[PDB]
Design a protein around this ligand. Structure first.
Ligand SMILES: [Mg+2]
Ligand SMILES: [Zn+2]
Ligand SMILES: [Zn+2]
Lengths: 89, 50, 51, 99, 74, 1166
């Protein structure tokens, strides 16, 4: 278990944005889009996300960056599909 | 000395009293127009009211 | 209304009150209709009734 | 007593024990303040919307719980939705503006 | 005092009760009035021919006698 | 880009009057008949209050006639009887209408206390009602003849006026007249004329009402509402399912009273329509119109006229206004307030084995609670084919399911709640532990925050479904994250009784005990000595210990020495983590010291080390207390040997004073007080006798003859350690108990000479009863009163939340020690702790800054202030914060259950109110009612008076009932002379100069004055110091912060003085205003800025003003709020807490604060 979140609160000051950020990450794992960034002890995504904050590899900046990266990762696949919609003309 | 104690017996008497007054109005109302020997003390006094 | 009238006399006349089938013979119709008629005739209870 | 998903009141959709499977615990105003003192917004919304008063949100939630997706698609509590019609039943025009 | 029961009781109480003779007076006035309109209806040419066109529909089975007249004198 | 038309996510809300066509928009048909259901087949009769055509299908997706029963057919309107086949849910939405023959007045706008139609037309109410009942004629658009526009005429008078002027004059009566008035009214023209007339005549009587009326009018103009709409043409009908006819058991039916009401309105209406085509006389159609008016009024809000009674039932039928209204305001969110799924409850028990972060949960409760989680998890791993098969599994309770439950339980917090939730600790999150049995087990250390005894109190459980709720629970509401009271930084997790009795018995020392004098290498072999039976738990011994001090730079130093200690303290040291010095465990460890231990541990090592520490302390406390074999016997209560003699000597005293009264040497009253005094002194004598005997009487031998130490007698240890019991209660057990008081409040002069160890006779017990009875009564009533206090408080605060980071004002209040009459009734270090300095503070010499400008003052900084002699520090407060519409975190303080500075977005208003309210149970002029008077600003009964202005004053005129006081300023103008009644004994020296705000008499002073004359900082200091006096007398620790935020809300409004933008005398928000003159200070007008005067509003008065009307309709009187808003067309933007709770979206605070912020900026933007 994770008894006290104090260490995570150190990493992100607000402690409310912690709930938000840890949430956003916890759903990335629960809905299967991704996998944990740190050994899962049988901890549910709630606690796995908190360990990821404690280890400093996940926060609002990183996630926004990663997501902004993934946007271009899908835009690369569909590149031909959506440009084939030239029928708009 | 100014606090009096009632109990089932006293209270029931009051309710039975209330029943008799609401039946009283009826008995007078019927005995107003009553025909002489036809009606008797049954047709007047009801049950349900008391 | 006809039933109320009978129930009035029969209340003290019988000393208890006419049985559910008592007014039935007194009334013309099939006489089992007392139950049906008596039910739909009832007025709905206020849904705001404090309990 | 414990209750997961029981019956619901008709007039306002709210948990009600009809089977002697008891209606849920009563969450009061003081408890709302308790949630307001903590920074917990989502617990409070789910408390007075999907867990109780939202005739839609409740089913959309339950299906997600078995699917393994913890979310809420909250919608509007039916209580407030009734207050709108009750106000609107008078001569008062009450609308929801903007976007 | 509001309570509309009162504002009725007080509004009608102004109207004075009719004497048994006064009743016939008013009733007599009615007869004159109606007979005027009855006579006034009798003086319209279209009012007759229409009644004619209606009874011709009655004899042609396009209507019934109950839907036109309630009876004459007799 | 296009906006939208269909469903977006709305912000704000608007409310206004409804046009007849507007009402028709909602209506999907006109209800033409009073019929409800067919009476045999219970189907709805068409065109009736229940109608399939107008409203909706009785059953889902099925036509009424039954022609189209297939789920494919949807948008089809049946050709036989038109019913669009759709879910029965739509019968809960679609409205209807009724077209009324004659116009009808809306009871809300006729009878609201400030009658709206009345003051809109500038016409009295009784006249307007007289016209509605056809009891007189009223003029409309009189033209130029003889008559006023609003003049009222009688029967004969109307006739005479008509013969003279046939046309160019008009008069009507009844509803149609009023509607004609409102339509003819030109608001623009009336406004202009009223503006001129306002200026011309100067009288307070005149312009008060004048300004009130003009405000409404221009508002009503700006509203968009047209006056005619207060008269109903069309009447909306509420959807059927909101007043259902649904069947019951035994075939009986039950329906809402509205039907009974609605039915009536229709009939009368229909009859009137009939009575028009029948050409009835006036006297009848008039009566019918009145009857229609009565029915409509009764429908909307019943009880403002005749109070119509429902059919066959005496109890008056509940109308639509009573559905909204209630106790208090709205039923929906008010207590109480909606039932919630996924919950349960039961009797609670101990469970001492628990770690502080967990709780025992009965097996059966958890199974039923997590049912959906269990169902979904069972088929995720494939132990169940489908959801149904999973249901059968848990319904069969197959053995395999318990392990699956351990999965869904492991990391998944649950919420625990107790009955009187006061502060936020009333609900706390725990990690569930599956437990056989039906009782909830609760960690002892938490029992204090809940005020939960074990005498059978029950607790409730809530499951946090959404992911955000799990993380909110774990990161906010979790047990381990709140260890400190938000009211004061002291730990609320302080060990309670058994645990502290253990540690007291552990670190204690007797004079001679096994192992005395020996020396040991370390704590490990100390326990080895004790557990093996060689050494006694308490014996004086030197042992080598290794302590730690982190006094280096972020670095733990180590030092070892031979400490002179006991065996128990040696053993206990094993728990103390790292950087604490051994000095903390070397004492006797009473309940007071044992708390400061945990506190320091928190302020030094941080959170995590303190938690595991706390757990260990509990475990060892219970354990060692059990070894101790502490008990309580009847021979444990030692009565003084001198008691009977003391009673006798005091008994002689009473007979002496009595002899003096028989001979008239002393008056009756003087006797009573005297006799009462000697008995009281006697009680003190006996108390301090048995206390000496009981405390020290252990007399024991070490190698010599004698010595005496503090007693090991059981009951003393309880009272001494701080576990339970106190000198007062002990005094009642052994020494005599008190002098009770007769009911009228006097105190009987023959006290209770016996005690509980001895017997009480008949009389003594009987006299004891009143104290008991008054005790129980007082608490049981004062408990409710306390709650009421919190209510007003959270209403007046609430929406206050930390918004900016630093508002950047140097302003703040001067914090000094309380220094009351003796030495320091409360120090400086406590007053300034955790707050932020307003400006840099000097040493005794200067160009030396000890604390630099705004810095959080923590334990080291406060001690640095203590190192130097600095006696006074100015501190930023929430009352002075420059931030508008909120408080900047820099101005608040650090306080939380965590030591860090308060986070951005935490809602301080609630926690302020809660922190003040929770201790309110312990209070008892003076007491809890004194607090209520303070926060309500109430001016006292016989107040003092303060000098209005500085300068030399003198007495003037003579005795009229006021003897005038004339003040003469040095430079400025004299003219201030206040009329003070001279029969009140004065103070102010007739020949001396008094500063403004000096004592012109004695007695309390109204804080209104203090605000006005002395200033803002002065009054806030007065409130905090007075209320803190009240609480501190009872021993309640409440930080001044909380009191200050309530204070800030007290002064939210101010009254303008100067002008150039807004109105002269308007009371208005200092947030709005200050932001308005700060905007004006530049740009705009060069400076047109207006001067205000800060005002003091009592708590119940300040809560009245809230911009959002949805909030006000909650706790205020619903009817007035809705109306007064509906005329102005007020648009509620939410933005607050109360309102957002009603509508059911994210609170604009805490976790939600990100949402509202992100939305608020999207709004009024591109
Ligand atoms: Mg109890
Ligand atoms: Zn059909
Ligand atoms: Zn500030």
């Amino acid at each position: 278990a994770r008894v006290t979140v104090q260490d995570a609160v150190e990493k992100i000051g607000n402690r409310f944005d912690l709930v938000l950020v840890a949430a956003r990450r916890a759903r990335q794992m629960q809905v299967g889009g991704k996998d944990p960034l740190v050994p899962e002890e049988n901890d549910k995504t709630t606690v796995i996300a908190l360990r990821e904050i404690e280890e400093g590899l996940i926060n609002n900046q990183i996630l926004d960056v990663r997501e902004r990266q993934e946007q271009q990762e899908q835009e690369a696949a569909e590149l031909q599909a959506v440009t084939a919609i030239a029928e708009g003309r | 000395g100014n606090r009096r104690i009632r109990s089932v017996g006293e209270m029931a008497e009051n309710q039975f009293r209330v029943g008799l007054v609401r039946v009283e109005r009826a008995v007078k109302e019927r005995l107003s127009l009553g025909d002489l020997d036809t009606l008797m003390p049954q047709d007047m006094i009801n049950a349900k009211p008391i | 209304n006809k039933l109320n009238r009978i129930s009035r006399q029969m209340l003290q006349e019988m000393g208890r009150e006419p049985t559910p089938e008592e007014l039935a013979e007194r009334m013309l119709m099939p006489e089992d209709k007392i139950r049906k008629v008596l039910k739909i005739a009832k007025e709905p209870i206020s849904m705001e009734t404090p309990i | 007593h414990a209750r997961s998903t029981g019956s619901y009141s008709l007039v306002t959709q709210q948990p009600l024990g009809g089977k002697a499977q008891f209606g849920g615990q009563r969450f009061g105003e003081m408890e709302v303040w308790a949630l307001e003192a903590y920074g917990a917004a989502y617990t409070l919304q789910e408390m007075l919307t999907v867990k109780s008063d939202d005739v839609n949100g409740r089913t959309k939630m339950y299906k997600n719980i078995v699917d393994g997706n913890h979310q809420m698609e909250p919608g509007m509590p039916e209580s407030f939705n009734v207050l709108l019609k009750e106000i609107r039943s008078l001569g008062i025009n009450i609308e929801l503006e903007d976007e | 005092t509001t309570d509309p029961v009162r504002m009725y009781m007080r509004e009608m109480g102004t109207v004075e009760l009719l004497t048994r003779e006064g009743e016939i007076d008013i009733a007599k006035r009615i007869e004159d009035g109606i007979n005027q309109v009855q006579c006034s209806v009798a003086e319209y040419p279209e009012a007759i021919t229409y009644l004619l066109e209606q009874y011709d529909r009655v004899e042609a089975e396009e209507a019934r006698l109950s839907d036109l007249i309630t009876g004459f004198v007799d | 880009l296009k906006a939208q038309t269909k469903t977006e996510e709305f912000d704000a809300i608007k409310i206004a009057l409804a046009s007849p066509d507007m009402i028709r928009s909602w209506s999907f048909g006109e209800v033409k008949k009073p019929e409800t259901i067919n009476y045999r087949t219970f189907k709805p009769e068409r065109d009736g209050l229940f109608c399939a055509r107008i409203f909706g299908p009785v059953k889902d997706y099925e036509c009424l006639c039954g022609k189209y029963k297939r789920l494919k057919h949807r948008g089809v309107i049946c050709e036989k009887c038109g019913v669009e086949v759709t879910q029965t849910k739509v019968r809960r939405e679609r409205m209807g209408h009724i077209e009324l023959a004659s116009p009808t007045a809306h009871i809300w706008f006729l009878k609201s206390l400030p009658s709206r139609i009345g003051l809109l037309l500038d016409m009295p109410l009784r006249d307007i009602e007289r016209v509605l009942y056809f009891e007189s004629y009223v003029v409309i658009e009189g033209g130029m003849t003889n008559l006023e526009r609003q003049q009222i005429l009688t029967e004969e008078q109307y006739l005479d006026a008509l013969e003279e002027f046939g046309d160019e004059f008009d008069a009507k009566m009844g509803a149609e007249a009023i509607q004609a008035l409102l339509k003819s009214m030109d608001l623009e023209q009336e406004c202009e004329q009223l503006r001129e007339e306002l200026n011309e005549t100067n009288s307070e009587t005149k312009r008060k009402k004048l300004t009130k009326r003009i405000k409404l009018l221009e508002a009503f103009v700006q509203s968009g509402n047209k006056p005619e709409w207060m008269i109903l043409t069309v009447l909306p009908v509420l959807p059927p399912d909101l007043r259902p006819l649904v069947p019951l058991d035994g075939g009986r039916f039950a329906t809402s009273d509205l039907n009974d009401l609605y039915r009536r309105v229709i009939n009368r209406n229909n009859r009137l329509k009939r009575l028009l085509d029948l050409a009835a006389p006036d006297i009848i159609v008039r009566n019918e119109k009145r009857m229609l008016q009565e029915a409509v009024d009764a429908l909307l809000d019943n009880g403002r006229r005749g109070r119509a009674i429902t059919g066959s039932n005496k109890r008056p039928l509940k109308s639509l206004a009573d559905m909204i209204k209630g106790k208090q305001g709205r039923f929906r969110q008010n207590l109480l307030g909606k039932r919630v799924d996924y919950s349960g409850r039961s009797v609670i028990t101990v469970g001492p084995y628990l770690r502080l972060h967990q709780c025992g949960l009965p097996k059966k409760m958890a199974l039923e609670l997590f049912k959906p989680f269990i169902y979904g998890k069972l088929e995720l791993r494939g132990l169940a084919t489908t959801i149904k098969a999973a249901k059968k599994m848990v319904e069969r309770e197959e053995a395999v399911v318990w392990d699956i439950l351990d999965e869904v339980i492991r990391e998944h917090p649950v919420l625990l709640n107790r009955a009187p939730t006061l502060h936020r600790l009333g609900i706390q999150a725990f990690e569930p532990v599956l437990i056989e049995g039906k009782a909830i087990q609760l960690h002892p250390l938490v029992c204090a925050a809940y005020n939960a005894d074990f005498d059978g109190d029950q607790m409730a459980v809530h499951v946090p479904l959404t992911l955000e709720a799990q993380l909110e629970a774990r990161a906010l509401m979790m047990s381990t994250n709140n260890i400190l009271s938000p009211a004061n930084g002291e730990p609320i997790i302080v060990p309670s009784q058994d645990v502290v009795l253990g540690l007291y018995y552990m670190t204690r020392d007797c004079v001679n005990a096994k192992g005395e004098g020996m020396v040991l290498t370390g704590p490990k072999e100390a326990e080895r000595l004790y557990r093996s039976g060689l050494a006694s738990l308490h014996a004086r011994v030197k042992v080598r210990i290794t302590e730690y001090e982190k006094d280096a730079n972020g670095e733990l130093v180590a030092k070892t020495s031979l400490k002179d200690t006991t065996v128990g303290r040696a053993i206990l040291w094993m728990i103390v983590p790292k950087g604490l010095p051994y000095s903390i465990v070397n004492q006797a460890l009473g309940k007071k010291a044992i708390s400061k231990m945990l506190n320091t541990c928190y302020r030094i090592l941080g959170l995590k080390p303190t938690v595991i520490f706390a757990d260990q302390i509990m475990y060892t406390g219970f354990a060692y207390a059990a070894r101790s074999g502490a008990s309580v016997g009847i021979d444990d209560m030692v009565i003084p040997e001198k008691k009977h003699e003391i009673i006798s000597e005091a008994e002689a005293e009473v007979a002496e004073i009595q002899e003096q009264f028989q001979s008239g040497l002393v008056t009756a009253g003087e006797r009573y007080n005297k006799v009462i005094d000697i008995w009281a002194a006697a009680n003190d004598r006996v108390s301090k006798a048995m206390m000496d005997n009981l405390q020290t009487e252990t007399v024991i031998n070490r190698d010599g003859q004698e010595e005496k130490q503090v007693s090991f007698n059981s009951i003393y240890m309880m009272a001494d350690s701080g576990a339970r019991g106190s000198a007062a209660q002990i005094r009642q057990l052994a020494g005599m108990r008190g002098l009770m008081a007769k009911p009228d409040g006097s105190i009987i002069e023959t006290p209770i000479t016996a005690n509980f160890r001895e017997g009480l006779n008949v009389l003594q017990y009987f006299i004891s009863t009143h104290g008991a009875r008054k005790g129980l009564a007082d608490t049981a009533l004062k408990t409710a009163n306390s709650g009421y206090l919190t209510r007003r408080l959270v209403d007046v605060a609430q929406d206050l939340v930390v918004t900016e980071d630093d508002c950047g004002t140097h302003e703040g209040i001067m914090m000094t020690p309380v220094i009351e009459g003796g030495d320091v009734k409360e120090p400086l270090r406590d007053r300034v702790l955790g707050r932020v300095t307003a400006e840099d503070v000097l040493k005794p010499g200067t160009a030396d800054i000890l604390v630099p400008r705004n810095t959080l003052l923590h334990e080291q900084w406060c001690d640095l202030l203590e190192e130097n002699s600095v006696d006074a520090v100015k501190v930023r407060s929430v009352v002075s914060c420059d931030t508008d519409f909120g408080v900047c975190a820099h101005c608040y303080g650090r306080d939380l259950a965590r030591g860090h500075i308060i986070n951005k977005g935490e809602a301080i208003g609630v926690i302020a109110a809660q922190s003040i309210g929770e201790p309110g149970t312990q209070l008892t002029t003076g007491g809890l009612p004194r607090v209520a008077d303070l926060f309500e600003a109430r001016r006292p009964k016989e107040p003092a008076i303060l000098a209005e202005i500085s300068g030399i004053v003198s007495f003037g005129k003579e005795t009229k009932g006021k003897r005038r006081l004339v003040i003469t300023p040095v430079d400025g103008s004299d003219p201030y002379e206040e009329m003070i009644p001279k029969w009140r004994q004065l103070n102010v020296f007739e020949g001396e100069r008094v500063e403004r705000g000096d004592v012109i008499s004695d007695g309390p002073e109204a804080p209104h004055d203090i605000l006005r004359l002395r200033g803002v900082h002065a009054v806030t200091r007065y409130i905090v110091n007075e209320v803190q006096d009240v609480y501190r007398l009872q021993g309640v620790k409440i930080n001044d912060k909380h009191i200050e935020v309530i204070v800030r809300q007290m002064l939210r409004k101010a009254t303008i003085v100067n002008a150039g933008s807004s109105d002269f005398l308007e009371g208005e928000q200092v947030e709005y205003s200050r932001v308005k003159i700060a905007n004006r200070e530049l740009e705009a007008n060069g400076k047109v800025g207006a001067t205000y005067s800060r005002d003091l509003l009592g708590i119940t008065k300040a809560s009245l003003a809230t911009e959002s009307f949805i909030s006000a309709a909650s706790f205020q009187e619903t009817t007035r709020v809705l109306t007064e808003a509906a005329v102005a067309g007020k648009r509620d933007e939410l933005r607050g807490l109360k309102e957002n709770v009603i509508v059911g979206r994210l609170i604009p605070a805490g976790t939600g604060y990100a949402y509202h912020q992100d939305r608020m900026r999207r709004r009024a933007a591109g």
